[PDB]
C-alpha cells in the first residue's frame, strides 16, 4: 500500500480555514470535522467567524478535500490526491457563475501534524448586488455532480472540470462552471491518473444549538469510470 | 404541541420491512438505524435479503418515516406525523414513472416498543424490462426535493404530491410523480396543517464491508413554508 494511501485507512481529523473577499465584502470561515476515505465520507461544520456570510453557503461547498474520496481497489493507481500526501497539493479553481461574477480560489491541502488542513484564499469580482449570489436567492442544498479528472504530465498534476447546478428558490438553476488544477507541493513522485470521475453527493444541515451563521456538511464521494 | 412529539426528543431506533413485487420480480428488504427529529436527521441501512435487487435503489428511497422531519418551534402546530404516535399512521402512495410502470405502496408507521417501525408492501406493474428502472439506468443518488402537504379533514389526515427527478446515467432525467396519503391508526386527536412543505435531502452510500446488495441512506428533512 502506497505511503500516502496509508494515511487515510482510518478517521482523519480536519481543519479548514478560508479568507474571502467578494465585491469588497471580506469574510473568514473556519471548519472542523473528520474524513473516512474507506467509506468516502466527510463530515464538517463551518462557521462564518466574521458575522453574516455575504454569499450563500452552497456556493462555498466545493471550496471548503478530495483526498477523502473513495477509490475502489481496482482504481487505487489513479488516486492523485492521496499520493501527494503528506506534503499535500495546491488546489486552484476559477468558478464562473453564469450571468454573474466569478470566484478565484487557491488552497493548500496537506497534513499539519496528524490533522489534514485545507487553507483557502477566495476572491470574487463582478457580482451583481441584486443577483442570485449576493441576493441570497439559492436553496440550502447541493445536488449530485460528477467531477471529471484528467492527467497533466507536464505540470506534474491533474486538470478537473465540472459545472454545478445550484437550485434557485423560484425553481430554476444557477450554473457555476468549475475549472480546477491540482499540483503536488512535495518533490516526491505522484500518481498521474487516467481519465475518470468522482461521483459526489452533499447534504447540508444546521445545528439548532448553533447561533452563528454556519453550515454542517456531509459529503459522500466515490471514484469511478474504469473497469477491472 | 402534543404527546406524540415527546417520543422524538431523543434518538429513536428504527426498523423497516419491505416486500416487493415488480413485474412479478419478487424481492424483500430489511432496514435498521436511528432517527433524530431535533436535527431532522435519519440514518438507515438496508439490505436485499433475496439476492440482487431488481430495481435501482434510488427508486425505493421514498418508500423505505417523515415523522423524523424537524418541525421548527413556531411550526409544531402542523406536524401531523408525530401527532399520530405512538398509535401510528398509514402511509399510502402511487408513483408514476413517466413513460414506464408504476409502484403502489401501503405502509404502517408506528411504534412497536421503544422502536419505530415502517412495514411496507409494494407492488409494481407495467414496467418496461429495458426501461430505466428494471434496466438499472439510474445514478446512485437522490437530489433534494420539496414535499408539499395539504390538510384533508375528510380522512383526518393529509394529501401529498411531489415530483422526483432521478438522474439517468446518460445525463437525462427520469420523472416519478409521487401521490401520497397519510391516515392515522389511532382514534385519538391528530393535527391537520395548513399547506406546508418538507425540504428533503438524501445521501446514498455503500458499506465497503457489506457483501449483500444494500443501501446506506442518510436524510436531512426540515419543514418550512410558514413563519
Residue numbers in the entry:
A (entry chain A): 1 to 64, 68 to 231
B (entry chain C): 1 to 64, 68 to 230
Sentences from the study reporting this entry:
BrUSLEE (Bright Ultimately Short Lifetime Enhanced Emitter) is a new green FP probe (λex/ λem 487/509 nm) with two reliably detected time-resolved FL components: a short one with a subnanosecond FL and a τ of ~0.66 ns, and a long one with a τ~1.5 ns. The protein was designed from EGFP by introducing three critical mutations, namely Thr65Gly, Tyr145Met, and Phe165Tyr. BrUsLEE shows an exceptional fluorescence brightness of the short FL component, reaching ~78% of that of the green EGFP precursor. The BrUsLEE demonstrates high performance in the multiparameter FLIM experiments and allows both a reliable detection of the probe and the recording of distinct FL signals in the presence of spectrally similar GFPs.
The crystal asymmetric unit of BrUSLEE contains three dimers AC, BD, and EF. Each dimer comprises two monomers related by a noncrystallographic twofold symmetry axis with a side-to-side packing at ~120°. The principal structural fold of the BrUSLEE monomer, shared with all other members of the GFP family, is an 11-stranded β-barrel with loop caps from both sides. The nearest shell of the Gly65-Tyr66-Gly67 chromophore is composed of 19 residues, forming an extensive H-bond network around the chromophore. The substitutions increased the free volume around the chromophore, causing a 0.7 Å shift of the hydroxyl group of Tyr66. The mutation of the chromophore Thr65 to Gly shifted the H-binding of catalytic Glu222 from Thr65 to the imidazolinone nitrogen, and the replacement of Phe165 with Tyr led to the formation of an H-bonded chain–Tyr165∙∙∙∙Arg96∙∙∙∙O=C-imidazolinone. The replacement of Tyr145 by a relatively flexible met facilitated the conformational change of Thr203, accompanied by a disruption of its H-bond with the Tyr66 hydroxyl. An increase in the distance between the His148 side chain and the Tyr66 hydroxyl from 2.89 Å to 3.52 Å indicated the disruption of another H-bond, typically stabilizing the position of the chromophore. These rearrangements in the nearest chromophore environment did not affect its absorbance and emission spectra but greatly impacted its FL, which predominantly depends on the chromophore’s local microenvironment. Compared to the EGFP precursor, which is characterized by an increased packing density in the chromophore area, in BrUSLEE the stabilizing contacts of the chromophore with the environment were noticeably weaker.
